[PDB]
Amino acid sequence: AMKAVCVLKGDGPVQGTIHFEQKASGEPVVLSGQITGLTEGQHGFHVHQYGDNTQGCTSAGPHFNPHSKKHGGPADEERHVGDLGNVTADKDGVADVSIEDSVISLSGDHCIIGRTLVVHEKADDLGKGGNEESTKTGNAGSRLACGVIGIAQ
């Protein structure tokens, strides 16, 4: 079994911890955790390409995209590998997270270990925003907090 963990923080009040679990090579990855300090509602949630936070979140690069595809939702076949959709904050700004994904991995070609998890300012539109950016970025806006995904026990 593989485990991973990520501590997210940024320039403001958003912070949280995300755990990844993957029973075997060909199993889905389960994320779970909590993020606090968010505006109420939905926020984009992506694995970005680099585990480089020398410039805070901006140095993480684009969404993790080995196959040079377009941005989509987690349920689309046409998606960046990093496209995990949205995460949902309550009225008190708390986002419990619980997600299963079979495209990211903790080993092999789609390994996200050593890369960066980012929570975003705006909802990810899942490729349906009808402008150029939706296709790149889901229009999710600024990177509110991030962390390098590391190996967990």
Could you list the residues known to form a binding site for Zn(2+), using ranges: 63, 71, 80, 83
Rounded CA-CA distance 11/43 in Å is 17
Here the tokens at position 145 are 């907090």
Residue 125 lies near Zn ion (rule: CB under 5 A): no
Active site residue 120: yes
Active site residue 71: yes
CB of 46 to Zn ion, least distance (A): 6
Residue of 18, 42, 45, 71 that binds Zn ion (CB under 5 A)? 71
Residue of 52, 76, 121, 133 that binds a copy of itself (CB under 8 A)? 52
113 Cβ contact list (under 8 Å, min separation 6): 4, 106, 107, 149, 150, 151
Active site residue 63: yes
- Tell me whether residue 53 or residue 142 sits nearer to a copy of itself (CB atom): 53
What track of x and - describes contact with Zn ion for positions 82 through 121 (by CB under 5 A)? -x--------------------------------------
Here the tokens at position 118 are 């980012």
Helix (H, G, I), strand (E, B) or coil at 93: coil
Residue 5 lies near a copy of itself (rule: CB under 8 A): yes
Residue 53 lies near a copy of itself (rule: CB under 8 A): yes
Q: Which amino acid is at 21?
A: E
- Tell me whether residue 130 or residue 150 sits nearer to a copy of itself (CB atom): 150
Active site residue 19: no
CB of 69 to Zn ion, least distance (A): 8
CA proximity to 149, closest of 14, 49, 73: 49
49 Cβ contact list (under 8 Å, min separation 6): 60, 61, 62, 63, 64, 65, 82, 115, 116
